[PDB]
Amino acid sequence: QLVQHEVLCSMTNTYEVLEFLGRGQVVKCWKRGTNEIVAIKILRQGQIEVSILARLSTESADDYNFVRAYECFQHHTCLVFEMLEQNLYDFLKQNKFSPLPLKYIRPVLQQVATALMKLKSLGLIHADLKPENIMLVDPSRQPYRVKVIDFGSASHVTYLQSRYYRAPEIILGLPFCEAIDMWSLGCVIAELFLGWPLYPGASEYDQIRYISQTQGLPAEYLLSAGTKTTRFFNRDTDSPYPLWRLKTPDDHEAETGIKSKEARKYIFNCLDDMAQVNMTTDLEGSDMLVEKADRREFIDLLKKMLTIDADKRITPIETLNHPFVTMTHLLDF
Ligand SMILES: O=C(O)c1ccc2c(c1)nc(Nc1cccc(Cl)c1)c1ccncc12
């Protein structure tokens, strides 16, 4: 867990520490001799990280919108990163949790989907995509330019992801791949759209309960394959063709001690019902057709990212081709 004060020595530079950033740990340091401020992270989970940072060090961090890693050096192994400004949670919070308009959501989506495409091409799973792991480079001089950070959970093709952004296959204990990151991306853009997480479950039970209430139960063939399914669902009869039912909150609390909570600011009966919420009424004529068409494309993309079966879930390349991202739906105006 190390300690603090001032200064550290690289294999190629020297870094004076100025400020603690959070708990491995991350610290803000001055690249001595330059005008650069950098973020240094001080950590087998480190071996996997450095290797993946290495396999990406050869790729274009700016082109694919993932954080630039400069050098690795032991001192405890340290990792030097470019300094970013603000993660998406602090952005929303600093904005009093008001919705983000779609026109600003679109370029964030496009940059993160691009990074996911780069990761899928290298056979890599990020496994911790979430608003804290997406940072605005400079919200004032480069508005809405973002970098994906934190490959500490990353892996090549258990208990993964941050719970609000966790895919059904991880909740249920199914086989999985890089598709889990696309589910997290859907939860991220929905949250920018709402100003609040879509599925803020306080436990894995509440998480799959929220998802099931808005999207229906996962299909029987998924439930029957999951190693964790019976923690949250009962077979009302034996297979073949069990009648799968979600445990009720009272029943689930009774056998578990976990009390269910209500953490949602919005409860949708289905994802289509999102399309209308928080729209500007003042829009006149052709501007409102634009907005209504933008929202239809956005929920259409959102539903394909939040497809419960990972085999049917849209891929990064295909979202980069979706009209919400490309804006071909707006040419009809
Ligand atoms: O892991 C990385 O790749 C990683 C890479 C870059 C940053 C980071 C983590 N964490 C930051 N802040 C932060 C905020 C809260 C908790 C923690 Cl542990 C760290 C940060 C800030 C400014 N610029 C780059 C970073």
Distances (CA, A) of 55 to 47, 114, 115: 12, 17, 14
**HSE-CB of 25 using CA atoms within 13 angstroms:** 14
Angle at which helices 102-121 and 180-194 pack, to 10 degrees? 170
123 C-beta neighbours (distance < 10 Å), count: 12
CATH number of 61-66+84-333: 1.10.510.10
Q: State how far the Cα of 141 lies from the Cα of 126, in Å rounded to an integer.
A: 28
Is 128 known to be catalytic?
A: yes
DSSP for 66-93, written as a single string: BPPEEEEEE--EEEEEE---EEHHHHHH
**DSSP H or E segment with residue 195:** none
Q: State how far the Cα of 323 lies from the Cα of 327, in Å rounded to an integer.
A: 5
From 184, 238, 2, 194, select the one nearest 99 (Cα to Cα).
Answer: 194
| Gaps in the chain (C to N distance exceeding 2.5 A) after | 23, 43, 75, 157
Assess contact for 233 and 219: CB atoms under 8 A: no
Angle at 8 between CA 5 and CA 9, to 5 degrees: 165
- Cis peptide, bond prior to residue 240, ω within 30 of zero: yes
User: Domain locations in the chain?
Assistant: 1-60+67-83, 61-66+84-333
Resolution in A: 2.2
Residue type, 220: E
- Residue to mutate, 149, 150, 151, ligand 1, most ligand atoms under 8 Å from C-beta: 149
Q: State how far the Cα of 177 lies from the Cα of 22, in Å rounded to an integer.
A: 30
Residue 41 Cβ inside 6 Å of ligand 1? The answer reads: yes
Cα end-to-end distance, the chain, whole Å: 57
**DSSP H or E segment with residue 206:** helix 204-215
**HSE-CB of 123 using CA atoms within 13 angstroms:** 3
Residue 26 Cβ inside 6 Å of ligand 1? The answer reads: yes
Q: State how far the Cα of 37 lies from the Cα of 76, in Å rounded to an integer.
A: 21
From 179, 185, 194, select the one nearest 148 (Cα to Cα).
Answer: 185
Residue 191 Cβ inside 6 Å of ligand 1? The answer reads: no
Note the residue count of the chain: 333
* Cα dihedral across residues 104, 108, 109, 114: positive or negative: positive
b/e per residue 283-298 (b: at least 16 CB within 10 A): eeeeeeebeebbbebb
Sequence-ordered list of residues with C-beta below 8 angstroms from that of 250, at least 6 positions apart, any chain: none
Assess contact for 135 and 234: CB atoms under 8 A: no
Assess contact for 193 and 266: CB atoms under 8 A: no
**HSE-CB of 271 using CA atoms within 13 angstroms:** 25
Residue 67 Cβ inside 6 Å of ligand 1? The answer reads: yes
Distance of CA 225 to the CA centre of its chain: 25
Beta strands in the chain (DSSP E): 8-9, 14-22, 25-31, 37-42, 69-74, 77-82, 86-87, 124-125, 134-138, 142-148, 155-156, 233-235, 244-246
Assess contact for 199 and 211: CB atoms under 8 A: yes
CA-nearest residue for atom 5, ligand 1, is 149
Q: State how far the Cα of 25 lies from the Cα of 30, in Å rounded to an integer.
A: 17
